[PDB]
UniProtKB/TrEMBL annotation, chain A:
<dbReference type="GO" id="GO:0008654">
    <property type="term" value="P:phospholipid biosynthetic process"/>
</dbReference>
<feature type="binding site">
    <location>
        <position position="217"/>
    </location>
    <ligand>
        <name>Mg(2+) 5</name>
    </ligand>
</feature>
<dbReference type="InterPro" id="IPR008949">
    <property type="entry name" value="Isoprenoid_synthase_dom_sf"/>
</dbReference>
<dbReference type="Pfam" id="PF00348">
    <property type="entry name" value="polyprenyl_synt"/>
</dbReference>
<feature type="binding site">
    <location>
        <position position="84"/>
    </location>
    <ligand>
        <name>Mg(2+) 1</name>
    </ligand>
</feature>
<feature type="binding site">
    <location>
        <position position="84"/>
    </location>
    <ligand>
        <name>Mg(2+) 2</name>
    </ligand>
</feature>
<dbReference type="InterPro" id="IPR053378">
    <property type="entry name" value="Prenyl_diphosphate_synthase"/>
</dbReference>
<feature type="binding site">
    <location>
        <position position="221"/>
    </location>
    <ligand>
        <name>Mg(2+) 6</name>
    </ligand>
</feature>
<dbReference type="InterPro" id="IPR033749">
    <property type="entry name" value="Polyprenyl_synt_CS"/>
</dbReference>
<keyword id="KW-0460">Magnesium</keyword>
<feature type="binding site">
    <location>
        <position position="90"/>
    </location>
    <ligand>
        <name>Mg(2+) 1</name>
    </ligand>
</feature>
<dbReference type="GO" id="GO:0046872">
    <property type="term" value="F:metal ion binding"/>
</dbReference>
<dbReference type="GO" id="GO:0004659">
    <property type="term" value="F:prenyltransferase activity"/>
</dbReference>
<keyword id="KW-0414">Isoprene biosynthesis</keyword>
<feature type="binding site">
    <location>
        <position position="90"/>
    </location>
    <ligand>
        <name>Mg(2+) 3</name>
    </ligand>
</feature>
<feature type="binding site">
    <location>
        <position position="92"/>
    </location>
    <ligand>
        <name>Mg(2+) 4</name>
    </ligand>
</feature>
<feature type="binding site">
    <location>
        <position position="94"/>
    </location>
    <ligand>
        <name>Mg(2+) 4</name>
    </ligand>
</feature>
Amino acid sequence: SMIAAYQARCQARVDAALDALFVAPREELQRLYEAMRYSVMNGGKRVRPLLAYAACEALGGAPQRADAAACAVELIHAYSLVHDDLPAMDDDDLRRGQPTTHRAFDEATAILAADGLQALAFEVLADTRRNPQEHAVCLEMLTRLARAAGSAGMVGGQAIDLGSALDQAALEVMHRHKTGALIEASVRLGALASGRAEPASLAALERYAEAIGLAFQVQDDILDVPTYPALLGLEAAKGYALELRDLALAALDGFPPSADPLRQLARYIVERR
Amino acid sequence: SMIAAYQARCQARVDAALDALFVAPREELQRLYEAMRYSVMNGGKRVRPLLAYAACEALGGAPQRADAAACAVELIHAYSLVHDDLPAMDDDDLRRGQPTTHRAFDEATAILAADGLQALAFEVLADTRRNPQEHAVCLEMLTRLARAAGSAGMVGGQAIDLGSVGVALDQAALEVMHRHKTGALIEASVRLGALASGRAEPASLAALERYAEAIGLAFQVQDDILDVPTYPALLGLEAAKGYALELRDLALAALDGFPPSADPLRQLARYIVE
Ligand SMILES: O=C(O)Cc1noc2ccccc12
Ligand SMILES: O=C(O)Cc1noc2ccccc12
Ligand SMILES: [Mg+2]
Ligand SMILES: [Mg+2]
Ligand SMILES: [Mg+2]
């Protein structure tokens, strides 16, 4: 039950690292960089960074090895939200009570700040001073993030959602892309940064990540009340959240104690209110 | 011309490689991928791919080694235009007589297709089957593209441009804008081709960078001239023309010592100023 403290450590660390990325290299770029900062440094909970750090630790790596991975996944996350808020998409004036970037600045600046954040996520992984892994591991991290962030993962999920009656299978297809791909990548990138990845471990961590990404979405529908409770019934939806947590924990069977943060996070997701 | 034939070879080759990237992996993604395809496969001249291929050859590499580089720079270019056409940006309904992507599909789909194109540019460079360089070189290619494409390069240029509305820019400020908005990506195209050669060294990279700096500006000056806060408005038409010639001269001088395999870059520099 120190998942809260684990979250707070991960957030403080990744926040410091992210904040350092938003220094305009010349004066004409100051507003752009302020918009980028405003779009990331918004008191978010940094679950994706948490996942990168915890995955790294689950395989025995010191967590600071995952700092670039943590930044990269948060940058992809933050850029996706800026675009999602835009009037052509979700058209939100607020995000967690605060003006969205296109309201605080302007629409063009929001489109562009977020574009710059996506490039920066890749920059941060390719940079061998910030991400000092073996070169082949850096490339695999970049590969995985590009596939997860793009039109076959996250962006694809946004298009599926836009394009959606819907049965359970199709709802799951959507979530698996829209949020699952980047959750799985956060876990995968942290695991790579451990220096101890092995195929069987990576697979197990992927099963974990698939289960939790879904658990979160089921539990969120439950807390709200074409949703998991409408589809399954409220009480069966609650049962399914438990089954997902269980699948997550079973995927971690045989991992050492250093995987406890991942176990605790899986419980936390279904125990929240 | 020799440069016309060179351009045509580069355009055929990169187009074939790009066209293969737009197969939706499942049916729910079809429309997204059609929008991606629509945004790239639009008969563009592929100057950034030409620069990658020509820079590669200038250093003695077989040009197919630059295929990934060529695709990646064109994907960045393409995505940038999709966002730039949107109603909050330049609000353009047409590009060369054809509907822009938000007009052909819708604004959200355009935003997302181009988002996916940016990712894909990085995917192609990081994929060691598509971009089979030494791993350290792949990482440098990715680094250089990310910096050129981002808030310190291309995206930065777009922001300088929006921050300059209603301000009379002098030549120095106009050049700062152009260097970021278009120069960064042109310089990266040349640099990534050079890296793909397998023969890059610091001296030759620096000289190619000087060449790319000159031709990137020459393109903009010449474009303003052909149209006739622009280069002709600032300088007068005749002095703008003289400057385009000076820029071509700087480009040709930067290629001092290069072998005949650099002739494509020399011929391009002349071509630009027509
Ligand atoms: O358990 C808690 O009190 C809050 C918390 N713990 O772990 C978290 C992870 C993400 C978001 C919130 C949390
Ligand atoms: O902060 C978030 O993006 C939502 C979130 N809060 O807790 C999560 C767990 C898994 C996936 C997502 C979450
Ligand atoms: Mg829901
Ligand atoms: Mg236009
Ligand atoms: Mg002009």
